[PDB]
Assembly symmetry: C2
Protein backbone atom coordinates (compact mmCIF):
# COMPACT_ATOMS: atom_id res chain seq x y z
CA UNK A 1 0.00 0.00 0.00
CA UNK A 2 0.98 3.65 -0.33
CA UNK A 3 2.44 5.56 2.62
CA UNK A 4 0.47 8.43 4.17
CA UNK A 5 1.69 11.85 5.30
CA UNK A 6 0.03 14.40 7.55
CA UNK A 7 1.07 18.04 7.09
CA UNK A 8 -0.25 20.39 9.78
CA UNK A 9 -0.90 23.87 8.40
CA UNK A 10 -1.30 26.80 10.77
CA UNK A 11 -1.58 30.54 10.26
CA UNK A 12 1.87 32.02 9.82
CA UNK A 13 3.36 28.84 8.38
CA UNK A 14 6.22 29.38 5.94
CA UNK A 15 4.53 28.64 2.61
CA UNK A 16 7.71 27.42 0.91
CA UNK A 17 8.43 25.00 3.75
CA UNK A 18 4.86 23.75 3.38
CA UNK A 19 4.44 23.50 -0.40
CA UNK A 20 7.82 21.98 -1.24
CA UNK A 21 7.34 18.97 1.04
CA UNK A 22 3.70 18.47 0.00
CA UNK A 23 4.58 18.64 -3.70
CA UNK A 24 7.67 16.41 -3.47
CA UNK A 25 5.91 13.80 -1.33
CA UNK A 26 3.03 13.62 -3.81
CA UNK A 27 5.54 13.18 -6.63
CA UNK A 28 6.77 10.19 -4.63
CA UNK A 29 3.34 8.57 -4.62
CA UNK A 30 2.72 9.42 -0.97
CA UNK A 31 -0.88 10.16 0.04
CA UNK A 32 -0.54 13.60 1.61
CA UNK A 33 -3.21 15.27 3.71
CA UNK A 34 -2.82 19.02 4.25
CA UNK A 35 -4.67 19.58 7.52
CA UNK A 36 -5.67 23.02 8.78
CA UNK A 37 -4.90 23.52 12.47
CA UNK A 38 -7.72 26.03 12.96
CA UNK A 39 -10.18 24.18 10.74
CA UNK A 40 -11.28 23.78 7.11
CA UNK A 41 -10.91 27.47 6.21
CA UNK A 42 -8.02 28.73 4.04
CA UNK A 43 -4.78 29.57 5.85
CA UNK A 44 -2.87 32.83 5.47
CA UNK A 45 0.82 31.88 5.41
CA UNK A 46 3.78 34.01 6.56
CA UNK A 47 4.25 35.74 3.21
CA UNK A 48 0.51 36.13 2.66
CA UNK A 49 0.12 33.17 0.32
CA UNK A 50 -3.32 31.67 0.98
CA UNK A 51 -3.52 27.88 0.94
CA UNK A 52 -6.73 25.90 1.33
CA UNK A 53 -6.19 22.68 3.32
CA UNK A 54 -7.56 19.30 2.23
CA UNK A 55 -9.37 19.00 5.56
CA UNK A 56 -9.38 20.21 9.16
CA UNK A 57 -6.87 18.69 11.58
CA UNK A 58 -9.80 17.54 13.71
CA UNK A 59 -11.06 15.39 10.83
CA UNK A 60 -7.66 14.28 9.52
CA UNK A 61 -6.83 13.22 13.08
CA UNK A 62 -9.57 10.59 12.86
CA UNK A 63 -8.08 9.21 9.64
CA UNK A 64 -4.79 8.16 11.18
CA UNK A 65 -2.32 6.67 11.65
CA UNK A 66 0.14 8.39 9.30
CA UNK A 67 3.60 7.18 8.29
CA UNK A 68 4.90 10.68 8.90
CA UNK A 69 3.68 13.85 10.57
CA UNK A 70 5.21 16.97 9.03
CA UNK A 71 5.55 20.29 10.84
CA UNK A 72 6.32 23.26 8.57
CA UNK A 73 8.28 26.21 9.87
CA UNK A 74 7.52 29.91 10.10
CA UNK A 75 7.91 31.65 13.46
CA UNK A 76 4.21 32.38 13.99
CA UNK A 77 3.18 29.08 12.45
CA UNK A 78 5.44 27.09 14.75
CA UNK A 79 4.14 29.06 17.72
CA UNK A 80 0.59 28.07 16.81
CA UNK A 81 1.66 24.43 16.51
CA UNK A 82 3.41 24.64 19.90
CA UNK A 83 0.31 26.01 21.61
CA UNK A 84 -2.04 23.38 20.16
CA UNK A 85 -3.28 20.61 22.42
CA UNK A 86 -4.37 18.64 19.35
CA UNK A 87 -0.83 18.76 17.96
CA UNK A 88 0.56 17.62 21.32
CA UNK A 89 -1.69 14.55 21.21
CA UNK A 90 -0.88 13.76 17.57
CA UNK A 91 2.87 13.97 18.14
CA UNK A 92 2.81 11.94 21.35
CA UNK A 93 0.81 9.22 19.61
CA UNK A 94 3.14 9.25 16.59
CA UNK A 95 6.17 9.03 18.88
CA UNK A 96 4.57 6.19 20.87
CA UNK A 97 3.76 4.17 17.74
CA UNK A 98 7.34 4.66 16.54
CA UNK A 99 6.24 6.80 13.61
CA UNK A 100 8.38 9.35 11.79
CA UNK A 101 8.08 13.02 12.74
CA UNK A 102 9.58 15.67 10.47
CA UNK A 103 9.91 19.35 11.31
CA UNK A 104 11.66 22.17 9.47
CA UNK A 105 13.04 25.62 10.36
CA UNK A 106 11.18 26.94 13.42
CA UNK A 107 9.01 23.83 13.22
CA UNK A 108 11.20 21.75 15.58
CA UNK A 109 10.45 24.15 18.44
CA UNK A 110 7.00 22.53 18.46
CA UNK A 111 8.69 19.27 19.47
CA UNK A 112 10.21 21.03 22.47
CA UNK A 113 6.85 22.51 23.46
CA UNK A 114 5.28 19.04 23.43
CA UNK A 115 8.33 17.29 24.94
CA UNK A 116 8.89 15.13 21.85
CA UNK A 117 12.05 13.13 21.20
CA UNK A 118 14.15 14.61 23.99
CA UNK A 119 17.78 13.55 23.66
CA UNK A 120 17.65 13.62 19.85
CA UNK A 121 20.24 15.37 17.72
CA UNK A 122 18.35 18.10 15.86
CA UNK A 123 18.80 21.19 13.72
CA UNK A 124 16.59 24.25 13.17
CA UNK A 125 16.74 27.58 11.43
CA UNK A 126 19.68 29.49 12.97
CA UNK A 127 17.30 32.06 14.47
CA UNK A 128 15.36 29.31 16.29
CA UNK A 129 18.37 27.59 17.85
CA UNK A 130 18.14 29.36 21.22
CA UNK A 131 14.43 28.59 21.59
CA UNK A 132 14.97 24.94 20.67
CA UNK A 133 17.92 24.58 23.04
CA UNK A 134 16.23 26.12 26.08
CA UNK A 135 16.89 23.59 28.84
CA UNK A 136 19.34 21.54 26.79
CA UNK A 137 16.83 18.79 25.98
CA UNK A 138 18.32 18.21 22.52
CA UNK A 139 21.81 18.21 21.02
CA UNK A 140 22.26 20.79 18.27
CA UNK A 141 23.54 20.18 14.77
CA UNK A 142 24.37 22.48 11.86
CA UNK A 143 23.64 19.81 9.24
CA UNK A 144 21.20 20.99 6.56
CA UNK A 145 19.09 17.90 7.30
CA UNK A 146 19.42 15.94 10.54
CA UNK A 147 17.87 12.53 11.10
CA UNK A 148 18.11 10.89 14.50
CA UNK A 149 15.98 7.79 14.44
CA UNK A 150 12.35 8.82 14.00
CA UNK A 151 13.04 12.55 14.43
CA UNK A 152 13.91 14.33 11.19
CA UNK A 153 14.72 18.04 11.20
CA UNK A 154 15.89 20.69 8.74
CA UNK A 155 16.89 24.38 8.68
CA UNK A 156 14.89 26.54 6.30
CA UNK A 157 13.34 27.36 2.91
CA UNK A 158 16.67 26.66 1.26
CA UNK A 159 16.85 23.17 2.75
CA UNK A 160 13.20 22.31 2.00
CA UNK A 161 14.01 20.12 -1.01
CA UNK A 162 16.65 18.18 0.94
CA UNK A 163 14.17 17.87 3.81
CA UNK A 164 11.39 16.58 1.55
CA UNK A 165 13.66 14.11 -0.25
CA UNK A 166 14.85 12.81 3.12
CA UNK A 167 11.23 12.08 4.04
CA UNK A 168 10.69 10.34 0.71
CA UNK A 169 13.77 8.16 1.22
CA UNK A 170 12.69 7.26 4.75
CA UNK A 171 9.24 6.15 3.57
CA UNK A 172 9.69 4.91 0.00
CA UNK A 173 13.43 4.23 -0.26
CA UNK A 174 16.52 5.65 -1.96
CA UNK A 175 15.47 4.46 -5.41
CA UNK A 176 12.20 6.40 -5.36
CA UNK A 177 13.92 9.46 -3.89
CA UNK A 178 16.44 9.51 -6.75
CA UNK A 179 13.67 9.07 -9.35
CA UNK A 180 11.69 11.95 -7.88
CA UNK A 181 14.77 14.18 -7.56
CA UNK A 182 15.98 14.02 -11.18
CA UNK A 183 13.05 15.92 -12.80
CA UNK A 184 13.34 18.73 -10.24
CA UNK A 185 16.55 20.11 -11.73
CA UNK A 186 18.24 20.55 -8.35
CA UNK A 187 21.94 21.46 -8.07
CA UNK B 1 8.61 53.71 -4.47
CA UNK B 2 8.36 49.92 -4.24
CA UNK B 3 8.45 47.69 -7.31
CA UNK B 4 5.39 45.67 -8.32
CA UNK B 5 5.15 42.12 -9.63
CA UNK B 6 2.32 40.32 -11.36
CA UNK B 7 2.23 36.53 -10.99
CA UNK B 8 -0.32 34.84 -13.26
CA UNK B 9 -1.74 31.70 -11.66
CA UNK B 10 -3.61 29.14 -13.75
CA UNK B 11 -4.95 25.66 -13.08
CA UNK B 12 -2.15 23.13 -13.33
CA UNK B 13 0.56 25.60 -12.34
CA UNK B 14 3.55 24.09 -10.54
CA UNK B 15 2.94 25.24 -6.95
CA UNK B 16 6.62 25.32 -5.99
CA UNK B 17 7.45 27.45 -9.02
CA UNK B 18 4.63 29.78 -7.98
CA UNK B 19 5.12 30.02 -4.20
CA UNK B 20 8.92 30.31 -4.13
CA UNK B 21 9.00 33.41 -6.36
CA UNK B 22 6.00 34.98 -4.62
CA UNK B 23 7.54 34.44 -1.16
CA UNK B 24 11.06 35.56 -2.12
CA UNK B 25 9.84 38.69 -3.92
CA UNK B 26 7.75 39.69 -0.91
CA UNK B 27 10.80 39.17 1.32
CA UNK B 28 12.48 41.65 -1.04
CA UNK B 29 9.85 44.30 -0.34
CA UNK B 30 8.25 43.83 -3.73
CA UNK B 31 4.49 44.38 -3.98
CA UNK B 32 3.33 41.08 -5.46
CA UNK B 33 -0.11 40.43 -6.91
CA UNK B 34 -1.07 36.78 -7.38
CA UNK B 35 -3.64 36.98 -10.18
CA UNK B 36 -5.93 34.10 -11.08
CA UNK B 37 -6.17 33.51 -14.81
CA UNK B 38 -9.70 32.08 -14.59
CA UNK B 39 -10.87 34.54 -11.96
CA UNK B 40 -10.94 35.12 -8.19
CA UNK B 41 -11.66 31.49 -7.29
CA UNK B 42 -8.99 29.23 -5.73
CA UNK B 43 -6.65 27.47 -8.16
CA UNK B 44 -5.86 23.75 -8.08
CA UNK B 45 -2.14 23.45 -8.81
CA UNK B 46 -0.31 20.54 -10.48
CA UNK B 47 0.22 18.62 -7.24
CA UNK B 48 -3.23 19.46 -5.89
CA UNK B 49 -2.14 22.30 -3.63
CA UNK B 50 -4.96 24.85 -3.60
CA UNK B 51 -3.92 28.50 -3.67
CA UNK B 52 -6.34 31.42 -3.46
CA UNK B 53 -5.18 34.35 -5.63
CA UNK B 54 -5.13 37.95 -4.40
CA UNK B 55 -7.40 38.91 -7.29
CA UNK B 56 -8.53 37.95 -10.78
CA UNK B 57 -6.24 38.68 -13.72
CA UNK B 58 -9.01 40.80 -15.22
CA UNK B 59 -8.91 43.12 -12.22
CA UNK B 60 -5.14 42.93 -11.73
CA UNK B 61 -4.61 43.92 -15.37
CA UNK B 62 -6.41 47.17 -14.59
CA UNK B 63 -3.92 48.02 -11.84
CA UNK B 64 -0.89 47.89 -14.12
CA UNK B 65 1.79 48.47 -15.13
CA UNK B 66 4.06 46.02 -13.30
CA UNK B 67 7.85 46.01 -13.09
CA UNK B 68 7.80 42.30 -13.82
CA UNK B 69 5.25 39.77 -15.07
CA UNK B 70 5.96 36.28 -13.78
CA UNK B 71 4.85 33.09 -15.50
CA UNK B 72 5.05 29.94 -13.34
CA UNK B 73 5.66 26.56 -14.92
CA UNK B 74 3.71 23.32 -14.85
CA UNK B 75 2.81 21.67 -18.17
CA UNK B 76 -0.94 22.20 -17.87
CA UNK B 77 -0.49 25.61 -16.28
CA UNK B 78 1.74 26.86 -19.09
CA UNK B 79 -0.74 25.46 -21.61
CA UNK B 80 -3.50 27.55 -20.06
CA UNK B 81 -1.29 30.65 -20.10
CA UNK B 82 -0.42 29.96 -23.75
CA UNK B 83 -4.09 29.78 -24.74
CA UNK B 84 -5.11 32.98 -22.93
CA UNK B 85 -5.78 36.08 -25.02
CA UNK B 86 -5.54 38.16 -21.84
CA UNK B 87 -2.03 36.85 -21.20
CA UNK B 88 -1.06 37.59 -24.81
CA UNK B 89 -2.08 41.23 -24.38
CA UNK B 90 -0.37 41.61 -21.00
CA UNK B 91 2.90 40.20 -22.31
CA UNK B 92 2.84 42.24 -25.51
CA UNK B 93 2.22 45.39 -23.48
CA UNK B 94 5.03 44.53 -21.04
CA UNK B 95 7.40 43.82 -23.92
CA UNK B 96 6.41 47.10 -25.60
CA UNK B 97 6.99 49.12 -22.40
CA UNK B 98 10.36 47.38 -22.09
CA UNK B 99 9.34 45.72 -18.83
CA UNK B 100 10.83 42.53 -17.40
CA UNK B 101 9.15 39.20 -18.15
CA UNK B 102 10.16 36.13 -16.15
CA UNK B 103 9.07 32.57 -16.93
CA UNK B 104 10.17 29.28 -15.39
CA UNK B 105 10.17 25.59 -16.42
CA UNK B 106 7.37 25.06 -18.97
CA UNK B 107 6.39 28.69 -18.43
CA UNK B 108 8.60 30.05 -21.26
CA UNK B 109 6.54 28.13 -23.82
CA UNK B 110 3.84 30.77 -23.23
CA UNK B 111 6.31 33.32 -24.61
CA UNK B 112 6.52 31.30 -27.82
CA UNK B 113 2.73 31.02 -28.02
CA UNK B 114 2.40 34.80 -27.82
CA UNK B 115 5.47 35.53 -29.99
CA UNK B 116 7.30 37.28 -27.15
CA UNK B 117 11.01 38.09 -27.25
CA UNK B 118 11.90 36.10 -30.36
CA UNK B 119 15.66 35.91 -30.82
CA UNK B 120 16.30 35.74 -27.07
CA UNK B 121 18.60 33.19 -25.49
CA UNK B 122 16.35 31.17 -23.18
CA UNK B 123 16.18 28.04 -21.07
CA UNK B 124 13.27 25.84 -19.97
CA UNK B 125 12.68 22.59 -18.17
CA UNK B 126 14.47 19.88 -20.22
CA UNK B 127 11.14 18.26 -21.12
CA UNK B 128 9.85 21.56 -22.55
CA UNK B 129 12.84 22.27 -24.79
CA UNK B 130 11.36 20.79 -27.97
CA UNK B 131 8.11 22.74 -27.56
CA UNK B 132 10.00 25.98 -26.92
CA UNK B 133 12.33 25.46 -29.88
CA UNK B 134 9.62 24.66 -32.43
CA UNK B 135 10.50 26.90 -35.37
CA UNK B 136 13.84 27.99 -33.93
CA UNK B 137 12.58 31.39 -32.72
CA UNK B 138 14.87 31.31 -29.68
CA UNK B 139 18.39 30.12 -28.92
CA UNK B 140 18.54 27.45 -26.23
CA UNK B 141 20.68 27.48 -23.11
CA UNK B 142 21.30 24.96 -20.34
CA UNK B 143 22.06 27.64 -17.74
CA UNK B 144 19.98 27.19 -14.58
CA UNK B 145 18.87 30.81 -14.98
CA UNK B 146 19.11 32.68 -18.27
CA UNK B 147 18.68 36.42 -18.64
CA UNK B 148 18.74 38.03 -22.07
CA UNK B 149 17.78 41.65 -21.69
CA UNK B 150 14.21 41.82 -20.40
CA UNK B 151 13.53 38.09 -20.87
CA UNK B 152 14.41 36.02 -17.81
CA UNK B 153 13.98 32.25 -17.84
CA UNK B 154 14.70 29.28 -15.59
CA UNK B 155 14.44 25.47 -15.62
CA UNK B 156 12.39 23.97 -12.80
CA UNK B 157 11.39 23.57 -9.14
CA UNK B 158 15.05 23.13 -8.22
CA UNK B 159 16.03 26.42 -9.86
CA UNK B 160 13.09 28.37 -8.37
CA UNK B 161 15.18 30.11 -5.69
CA UNK B 162 17.84 31.12 -8.21
CA UNK B 163 15.05 32.32 -10.52
CA UNK B 164 13.39 34.38 -7.77
CA UNK B 165 16.66 35.89 -6.56
CA UNK B 166 17.49 36.88 -10.14
CA UNK B 167 14.18 38.75 -10.31
CA UNK B 168 14.96 40.47 -7.02
CA UNK B 169 18.39 41.54 -8.28
CA UNK B 170 16.92 42.89 -11.53
CA UNK B 171 14.34 44.96 -9.65
CA UNK B 172 15.94 45.90 -6.32
CA UNK B 173 19.66 45.33 -6.90
CA UNK B 174 22.27 42.80 -5.82
CA UNK B 175 22.51 44.26 -2.30
CA UNK B 176 18.88 43.47 -1.55
CA UNK B 177 19.16 40.10 -3.28
CA UNK B 178 22.05 39.14 -0.98
CA UNK B 179 20.19 40.35 2.14
CA UNK B 180 17.12 38.32 1.21
CA UNK B 181 19.17 35.24 0.33
CA UNK B 182 21.08 34.87 3.62
CA UNK B 183 18.12 33.92 5.88
CA UNK B 184 16.93 31.29 3.38
CA UNK B 185 19.74 28.87 4.26
CA UNK B 186 20.48 28.05 0.62
CA UNK B 187 23.50 25.93 -0.31
Amino acid sequence: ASKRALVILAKGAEEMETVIPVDVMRRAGIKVTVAGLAGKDPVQCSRDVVICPDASLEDAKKEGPYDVVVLPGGNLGAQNLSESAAVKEILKEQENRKGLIAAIAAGPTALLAHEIGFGSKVTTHPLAKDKMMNGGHYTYSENRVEKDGLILTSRGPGTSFEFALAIVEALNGKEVAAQVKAPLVLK
